[PDB]
Design a protein around this ligand. Structure first.
Ligand SMILES: Cc1cc2cc(C#N)ccc2c(C)c1Nc1ncnc(Nc2ccc(C#N)cc2)n1
Ligand SMILES: [Mg+2]
Lengths: 554, 406
């Protein structure tokens, strides 16, 4: 007899105010009953479960399932009700590792730890909540009452406790062997290293020996899992990685569900396949909510799908992370609020790729979107590589300085260099800080009746120039914008504009180069064509001449 | 040697806040620190039966090459019970106030067992390749609201001799910070501070100090331009600013000044001031020189701080409780390694304003930052040097009242 260290139990309790499960046992066929009796008998032999007296008031339904029309049955304990009453745990499975942040390994061996699962004891004061009853033949005898002594499969706290205990066991080994890496997934332990294969095999045997200290025996045979590994949608190779084969289906008609699947695959493939666009395909799913509803594909979306098919023509792989080298992220504008980026260390050898779509809003510009993209890539990089990459952006230094030194908000971009690859991000207009000498002064105003929705928009100038335009189906704000639009239309290359609209000023001071509103867009187009524009604000109804509200009060 | 029972608020479970991404340097620092803390019995490893979590990261104090572990107990502090001192109003009237870091002291008092599970935190790994290292506190944690309240009884008896020996020096305590103010000469002030920290070290990094000058804290009144020739634009801006000031000061009139703008004139055209206009403007100045009517502080209300970016490294700010009722106004133009960084400037600004607010009223204000949420949340930790963390929201619409405060 060789003494093995007992595995420390995790103190598990039920949710406060809740009691254990008390679910009736379902009626079974004689066949299923005999099967379950045999199975639970051998399980009791192994020490997984134990017979309990009539005192235990709790019960969990147990079922028998015939495995794919075979000669053997299988036990299935429905722990749903117990899981509803079981406390929350610290799930470490949240946030899986990304392949782009991994380091290349010369050897990656896999060990089976399915037998190590049943060596993890359940908390003694909690076992009574895992009680279940095997129905007796013809219900003429008291049913057989069992309870779990180990972590029950399907139970809420099983994976967390298993992972925590296993980690606590492997910790000193991983600590005293820094030349290897150990990762746990399901019933499998993965060990990787760059050591010579002999030293590597030695390390593996030492790991098994270490696991023997807790009586954990791993199968003494070559595991059926060799590189590459299929993992969480990835293909993991020793020196490279990729996504599992993305197959875009051929269809003459597409439903909502089909488009959702398509955009799903595209989004998943966009992390290694550069240039993947999804806007024209995602904008077809605007307020549908009907998985069977067939939506006609626009030409704009058909073309996008075609381009996507061209990109996914041949397999593309990504390299692993080399901590000794510098990290670089380059960004390009795709238009329609779409952005794409690549993250690499050595040229033409991407660690990963990605994309960014503009947020939902009424107005926006390319500079803001670029900033947001930079922030996203930064956060993702800190997640994956633990540091900020050096950026290559399609924007002049002068442009950025002019932007952030004049922008009303505080904005910042980490260390970056300019890369001359069109379309470049630019400022399309720049309002003056002081009034313009010699330029005509356009006092503008707009006003609309709330009931009849009738309005007027117009201007008066110092040269005597005037205009008042009647409008139907409009609001106060729309008229106020319309006035500015008129002032921009009928003025020279340089113009001063006086408005009392805090709304319009609030929009133009945000400096958009694109908008949902056609009126604002027209205003922008007018702004771009100008040489100098000064926009001044004054309080309304304060007897300020020029502010001719009287031409709008009608 | 004995612990005081601590519980949460009725109907509230412990905090479950996610750990935000940490850089490599900060992770190494936090591991290195928490190792020694575990060796000293300050913290302990926990199992999967503890679902609670509080964000944690690392900083560097004012001019120091040693990392400091900082925990974001903001969620725990608003869920923990209200531990039930009248704020020293003389603290903001002293000539010099040195800030000390007496946080380590808290590590000498054991925390209530049944509460420890709530101070759980996680040191993350890069790319989550290894499981995160989980800890919980055995002693009073830094940054927690309960720590200064519990240690108060000890701190009092600790400072009794120094306080009895110096009845002029005003001492205040907020979180992990000890504000010590006096009217002594700066040298003698520093001697008293060093004497105090040596009085604390003997009593069982407290070597750093942060000197402030509340007497030199200038306030911002509302000022109007003084010109010899006024253009149409000048008068328009004047009328606008006065119209804004009318919401604060009642007697503000702009009628006569507005009479000058009648007729559609060019913005650059100079307009000679009439007598009624000049009189009106004068009266307006006289009104603006007076304090704001009916301005009081309410300890039960929230302090709100608004910040405006004025450009060229200049920022303006206002602390109030009710709209148009400023309890404090100010302006900054600091050059602290942030010549080409707006976010660093804004962060330092937030810290300064918060410090002032702690000195004056005894609690932190709720900030309204002129910055996008993502941008701020991405970078603010890289420039933070305070042991506390205030609350903040974001303003996405450009306020028209920017230039009026400049
Ligand atoms: C985080 C992780 C997940 C795994 C998932 C599987 C699966 N299925 C197998 C092994 C896994 C391993 C060792 C991991 N951990 C880890 N830490 C540092 N570097 C690496 N590099 C690495 C380099 C090539 C390969 C390959 N081929 C795998 C990992 N991996
Ligand atoms: Mg009007």
């Amino acid at each position: 007899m060789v003494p093995i260290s007992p595995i420390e139990t995790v103190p598990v309790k039920l949710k406060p105010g809740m009691d254990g499960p008390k679910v009736k046992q379902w009626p079974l066929t004689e066949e299923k009953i005999k099967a379950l009796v045999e199975i639970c008998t051998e399980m009791e032999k192994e020490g997984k479960i134990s017979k309990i007296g009539p005192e235990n008031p709790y019960n969990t339904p147990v079922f028998a399932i015939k495995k794919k029309d075979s000669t053997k049955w299988r036990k299935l304990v429905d722990f749903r009700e117990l899981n509803k009453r079981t406390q929350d745990f610290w799930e470490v499975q949240l946030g899986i590792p990304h392949p782009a942040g991994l380091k290349k390994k010369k050897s990656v061996t896999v060990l089976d730890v399915g037998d190590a699962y049943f060596s993890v004891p359940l908390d003694e004061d909690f076992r009574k909540y895992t009680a279940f009853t095997i129905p007796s033949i013809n219900n003429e005898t008291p049913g057989i009452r069992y309870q779990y002594n180990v972590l029950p499969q399907g139970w809420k706290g099983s994976p967390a406790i298993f992972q925590s205990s296993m980690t606590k066991i492997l910790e000193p080994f991983a600590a005293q062997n820094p030349d290897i890496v150990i990762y746990q997934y399901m019933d499998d332990l993965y060990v990787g290293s760059d050591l010579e294969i002999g030293q590597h095999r030695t390390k593996i045997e030492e790991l098994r020996q270490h696991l023997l200290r807790w009586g954990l025996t791993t199968p003494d045979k070559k595991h059926q899992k060799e590189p590459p590994f299929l993992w969480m949608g990835y293909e993991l190779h020793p020196d490279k990685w990729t996504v599992q084969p993305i197959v875009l289906p051929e269809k003459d008609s597409w439903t909502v569900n089909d488009i959702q699947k398509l955009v799903g695959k595209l989004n998943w493939a966009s992390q290694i396949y550069p240039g993947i666009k999804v806007r024209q395909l995602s904008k077809l799913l605007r307020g549908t909510k009907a998985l069977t509803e067939v939506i006609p594909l626009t030409e704009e979306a058909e073309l996008e799908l075609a381009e996507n098919r061209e990109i996914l023509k041949e397999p593309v792989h990504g390299v692993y992370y080399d901590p000794s080298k510098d990290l670089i992220a380059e960004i390009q504008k795709q238009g329609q609020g779409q952005w794409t980026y690549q993250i690499y260390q050595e040229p033409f050898k991407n660690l990963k790729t990605g994309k960014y779509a503009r947020m939902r809003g009424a107005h926006t510009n390319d500079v803001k979107q670029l900033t947001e993209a930079v922030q996203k890539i930064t956060t993702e990089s800190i997640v994956i590589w633990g540091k900020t990459p050096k950026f290559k952006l399609p924007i002049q230094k002068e442009t950025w300085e002019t932007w952030w030194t004049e922008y009303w908000q505080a904005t910042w971009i980490p260390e970056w260099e300019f890369v001359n690859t069109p379309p470049l991000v630019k400022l399309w207009y720049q309002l003056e800080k002081e009034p313009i000498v010699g330029a005509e002064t356009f006092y503008v105003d707009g006003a609309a009746n709330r009931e009849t929705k009738l309005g007027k928009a117009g201007y008066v100038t110092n040269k005597g120039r005037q205009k008042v335009v009647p409008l139907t189906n409009t609001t106060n704000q729309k008229t106020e914008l319309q006035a500015i639009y008129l002032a921009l239309q009928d003025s020279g290359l340089e113009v001063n504009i006086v408005t009392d609209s805090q709304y319009a000023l609030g929009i133009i001071q945000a400096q958009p180069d694109k908008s949902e509103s056609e009126l604002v867009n027209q205003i922008i187009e007018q702004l771009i064509k100008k040489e100098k524009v000064y926009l001044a604000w004054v309080p309304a109804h304060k007897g300020i001449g020029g502010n001719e509200q009287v031409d709008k009060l009608v | 040697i004995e612990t005081v029972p601590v519980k949460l608020k009725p109907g509230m479970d412990g905090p479950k806040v996610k750990q935000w991404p940490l850089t490599e340097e900060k992770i190494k620092a936090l591991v290195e620190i928490c190792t020694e803390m575990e060796k000293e019995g300050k913290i302990s490893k926990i199992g999967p039966e503890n679902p609670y979590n509080t964000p944690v990261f690392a900083i560097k104090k004012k001019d120091s090459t040693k990392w400091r572990k900082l925990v974001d107990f903001r969620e725990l502090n608003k869920r923990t019970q209200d531990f039930w001192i009248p704020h020293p109003a003389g603290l903001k009237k002293k000539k010099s106030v040195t800030v000390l870091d007496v946080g380590d002291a808290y590590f000498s008092v054991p925390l209530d067992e049944d509460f420890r599970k709530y101070t759980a935190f996680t040191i993350p790994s890069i790319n989550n390749e290894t499981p995160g290292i989980r800890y919980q506190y055995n002693v009073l944690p830094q940054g927690w609201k309960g720590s200064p309240a519990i240690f108060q009884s000890s701190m009092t008896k600790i400072l009794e001799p120094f306080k009895k020996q110096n009845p002029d020096i005003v001492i205040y305590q907020y979180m992990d910070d000890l504000y010590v103010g006096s009217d002594l000469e700066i040298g003698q002030h520093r001697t008293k501070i060093e004497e105090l920290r040596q009085h604390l070290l003997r009593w069982g990094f407290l070597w750093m100090g942060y000197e402030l000058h509340p007497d030199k804290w200038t306030v911002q009144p509302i000022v109007l331009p003084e010109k010899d020739s006024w253009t149409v634009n000048d008068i328009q801006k004047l009328v606008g600013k006065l119209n804004w000031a009318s919401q604060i000061y009642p007697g503000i009139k702009v009628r006569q000044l507005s009479k000058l703008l009648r007729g559609t004139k060019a913005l650059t055209e100079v307009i000679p001031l009439t007598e009624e206009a000049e009189l009106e403007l004068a009266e307006n100045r006289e009104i603006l020189k007076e304090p704001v009517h009916g301005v009081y502080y309410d300890p039960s209300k929230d302090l709100i701080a608004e910040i405006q970016k004025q450009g060229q490294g200049q920022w303006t700010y206002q602390i109030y409780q009710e709209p148009f009722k400023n309890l404090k106004t100010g302006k900054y133009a600091r050059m602290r390694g942030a010549h080409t960084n707006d976010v660093k400037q804004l962060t330092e600004a937030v810290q300064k304003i918060t410090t002032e607010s702690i000195v004056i009223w005894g609690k932190t204000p709720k900030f309204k930052l002129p910055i996008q949420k993502e941008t701020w949340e991405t970078w603010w930790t890289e420039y933070w040097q305070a042991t506390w963390i205030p609350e903040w929201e974001f303003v996405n619409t450009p306020p028209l009242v920017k230039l009026w405060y400049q």
